[PDB]
């Protein structure tokens, strides 16, 4: 990877970029024919929002997603990981990938509510004041529809609406 250091010396600014150590993909992938990192390791349909060891490889230091052109993921898998990372952040599973705060900014304390499988952003969702009849019930989405094809080990399929 490449870093950038800004140094002001003698009322002069010097901008430089250095090449740091870069991690290498593990040798001998089980599926060399695979066209993306996911299917090269037979991981398609076999990871979830809580698989931070997997998810953390495709995100920036502050929690942002990495471009698909760089990682090499396909559109389908790239979108699945994108949602999985959002759910991982919201669940509190990435405590070392927090947003960058400018100097002098200490966030005010906010109520702690443990949550998981959170599709939407908490602030953007309204209360379900009128539930509607049983035949037209307003449902609370849980999880993501992008993961509907994940391997199901139970006879009941994933319920995405509660």
């Amino acid at each position: 990877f490449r870093e950038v250091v800004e140094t002001q010396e003698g009322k002069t600014t010097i901008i430089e970029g250095r090449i740091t150590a870069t991690p290498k993909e593990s040798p001998n992938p089980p599926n060399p024919s695979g066209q993306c990192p996911i299917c090269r390791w037979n991981l398609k349909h076999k990871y979830n929002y809580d698989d931070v060891l997997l998810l953390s490889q495709f995100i920036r230091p502050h929690g942002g997603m990495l471009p698909r052109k760089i990682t090499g993921l396909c559109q389908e898998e790239h979108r699945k990981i994108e949602e999985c990372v959002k759910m991982a952040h919201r669940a509190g599973l990435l405590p070392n990938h927090r947003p960058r705060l400018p100097e002098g900014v200490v966030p005010k304390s906010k109520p702690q509510l443990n949550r998981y499988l959170t599709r939407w952003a908490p602030g953007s969702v309204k209360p379900i004041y009128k539930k509607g009849p049983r035949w037209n019930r307003v449902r609370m989405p849980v999880g993501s529809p992008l993961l509907r094809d994940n391997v199901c080990y139970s006879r009941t399929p994933w319920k995405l609406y509660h």
């Binding site: 001998n28 992938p29 089980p30 390791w41 037979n42 991981l43 076999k46 997997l54």
Partner: peptide, 8 residues
């Protein structure tokens, strides 16, 4: 050290 069907 990874078989053809190995999954992490």
């Amino acid at each position: 050290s990874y078989l053809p069907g190995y999954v992490p």
